Structure 1
Amino acid sequence: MAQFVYTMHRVGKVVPPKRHILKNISLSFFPGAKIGVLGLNGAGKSTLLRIMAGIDKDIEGEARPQPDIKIGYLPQEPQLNPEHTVRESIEEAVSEVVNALKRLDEVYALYADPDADFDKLAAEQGRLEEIIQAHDGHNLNVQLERAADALRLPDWDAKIANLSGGERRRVALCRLLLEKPDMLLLDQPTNHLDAESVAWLERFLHDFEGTVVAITHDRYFLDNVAGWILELDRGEGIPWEGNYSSWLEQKDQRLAQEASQEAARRKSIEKELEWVRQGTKGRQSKGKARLARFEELNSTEYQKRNETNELFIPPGPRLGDKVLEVSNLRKSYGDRLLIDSLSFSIPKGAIVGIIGPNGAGKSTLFRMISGQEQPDSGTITLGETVKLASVDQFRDSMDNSKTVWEEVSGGLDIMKIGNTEMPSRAYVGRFNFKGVDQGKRVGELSGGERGRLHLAKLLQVGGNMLLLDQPTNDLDIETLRALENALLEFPGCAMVISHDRWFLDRIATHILDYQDEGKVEFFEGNFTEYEEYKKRTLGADALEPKRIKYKR
Structure 2
Amino acid sequence: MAQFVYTMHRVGKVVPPKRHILKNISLSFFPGAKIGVLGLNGAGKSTLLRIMAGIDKDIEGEARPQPDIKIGYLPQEPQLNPEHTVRESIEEAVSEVVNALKRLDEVYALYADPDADFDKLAAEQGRLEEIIQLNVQLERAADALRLPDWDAKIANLSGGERRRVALCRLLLEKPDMLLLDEPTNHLDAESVAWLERFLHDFEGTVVAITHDRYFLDNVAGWILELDRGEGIPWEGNYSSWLEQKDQRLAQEASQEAARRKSIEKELEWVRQGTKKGKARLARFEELNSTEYQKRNETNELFIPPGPRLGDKVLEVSNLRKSYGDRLLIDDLSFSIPKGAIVGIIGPNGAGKSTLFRMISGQEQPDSGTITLGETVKLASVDQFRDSMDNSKTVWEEVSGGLDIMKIGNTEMPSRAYVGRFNFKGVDQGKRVGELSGGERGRLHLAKLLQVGGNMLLLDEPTNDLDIETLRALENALLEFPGCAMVISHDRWFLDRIATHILDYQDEGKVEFFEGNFTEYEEYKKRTLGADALEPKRI
Q: TM-score, normalised by structure 1?
A: 0.44
- Which stretch shifts more, 296-305 or 373-382? 296-305
Matched, 1:243 2:237: yes
Whether the aligned pair in 1 keeps the contact of 2:307 and 2:454 (CA below 8 Å) is yes
Q: Deviations over 1:274-324 (max 9, x none)?
A: 99999999xxxx999999999999999999999996201111211212212
Distance (Å, rounded) in 1 between the aligned partners of 2:326 and 2:164: 20
**Cα distance change on mapping 1:146 and 1:124 into 2, 3 Å:** same
| Residue 339 to residue 263, structure 1, CA distance change in 2 (3 Å) | closer
The alpha carbon displacement at 1:515 in A equals: 1.1
Q: Kindly report the root-mean-square deviation, in angstroms, between the aligned alpha carbons of the 2 structures.
A: 29.9
More off after superposition, 378-387 vs 73-82: 73-82
Shift of 1:380: 0.7
- For residues 147-173 of structure 1, what are the alpha-carbon distances to aligned partners after superposition, in whole Å with 9 as ceiling and x for unaligned? 999999999999999999999999999
1:491–1:515: structure 2 CA closer, same or farther, 3 Å change rule?
same
C-alpha displacement of 1:127: 85
**Aligned 8 A contact 1:331 1:339 in 2:** yes
Question: 2:390 aligns to what SS in structure 1?
Answer: coil
Provide the C-alpha distance between the structure 2 equivalents of 1:224 and 1:483, rounded to a whole number of angstroms: 50
Moved more, 220-229 or 518-527: 220-229
In 1, Cα distance between equivalents of 2:505 and 2:160: 17
1:362 Cα deviation from its structure 2 partner: 0.7
**Which has the larger strand fraction?**
2
Summarize the Cα distance change of 1:171–1:547 in structure 2 as closer, same or farther, 3 Å threshold. farther
**Partner Cα distance (2:287, 2:238) in 1:** 37
Q: Give the counterpart of 1:216 among 197, 210, 235.
A: 210
Q: Which has the higher Rg, Structure 1 or Structure 2?
A: 2
Greater RCO (Cα-Cα under 8 Å, separation 6 or more): 1
CA contact (8 A) 1:41 1:449 kept: no
Secondary structure at the counterpart of residue 343 of structure 2: strand
Contact 2:298 2:420 in 1 (8 A): no
Structure with the higher fraction of residues in helix conformation: 2
Moved more, 28-37 or 7-16: 28-37
Does structure 2 retain, via aligned residues, the 8 Å contact 1:10–1:24? yes
Which secondary structure does the structure 1 equivalent of 2:118 belong to? coil
Is 1:509–1:524's contact at 8 Å kept on the other side of the alignment? yes
Matched position secondary structure for 2:56: coil
C-alpha separation in 1, matches of 2:485 and 2:35: 36
- Taking the aligned partners of 2:171 and 2:331, their CA distance within structure 1 comes to 40
Taking a change above 3 Å as real, the CA distance of residues 329 and 438 of structure 1, as seen in their structure-2 partners, is: same
Larger CA deviation: 144-153 vs 7-16: 144-153
SS in 1 for 2:61: strand
Note the 1:304-343 alignment, pairs <5 A.
Answer: 310-343=300-333
Shift, 1:31, TM fit? 58
How far apart are residue 117 of structure 1 and its match? 101
Q: CA separation in 1, counterparts of 2:333 and 2:408?
A: 31
Identity of aligned residues (%): 99
Aligned residue for 2:407, secondary structure, equals coil
**Once the two structures are superposed, what CA deviation does each residue of 1:224-268 show, in whole Å capped at 9, x if it has no partner?**
999999999999999999999999999999999999999999999
CA contact (8 A) 1:309 1:478 kept: no
How far, CA to CA, are the matches of 1:362 and 1:199 in structure 2?
Answer: 77
Note if contact 1:395-1:451 (Cα within 8 Å) is conserved in structure 2.
yes
Structure 1 residues 260 and 404, CA gap change in structure 2 (3 angstroms) = closer
Q: Cα–Cα, structure 1 residues 27 and 202, in superposed 2: closer, same or farther, change >3 Å?
A: same
Shifted more, 253-262 versus 384-393: the winner is: 253-262
- Distance 1:375-1:268 versus aligned 2 partners, 3 A rule: closer
SS at match of 2:353: helix
Deviation digits for residues 365-390 of structure 1, max 9, x if unmatched? Answer: 11111111110111211111110101
What secondary structure is seen at the aligned counterpart in 1 of 2:336? coil
Kindly tell me: are residues 201 and 381 of structure 1, through their superposed partners in 2, closer, same or farther at Cα, counting changes over 3 Å?
farther
Deviations along 1:489-542, one digit per CA (max 9) or x if unpaired, are: 111111010012121011111110111212111111223432442354351327
Q: Please, which moves more after superposition, 173-182 or 295-304?
A: 173-182
Gaps in structure 2 of 5+ consecutive residues = none
**CA 1:196/1:495 → structure 2, altered by over 3 Å: closer, same or farther?**
farther
- C-alpha deviations, 1:338-383, integer Å up to 9, x for none? 1111111111110000010121111111111111111011121111
Within 2, Cα distance between the matches of 1:546 and 1:169?
82
- Residues 463, 489 of structure 2: 8 Å contact kept: no
Give the number of aligned pairs: 538
Question: Secondary structure of 2:291's match?
Answer: coil
Tell me, yes or no, if the aligned pair for 1:307 and 1:478 is still in contact at 8 Å. Answer: no
TM-score w.r.t. structure 2 length?
A: 0.45
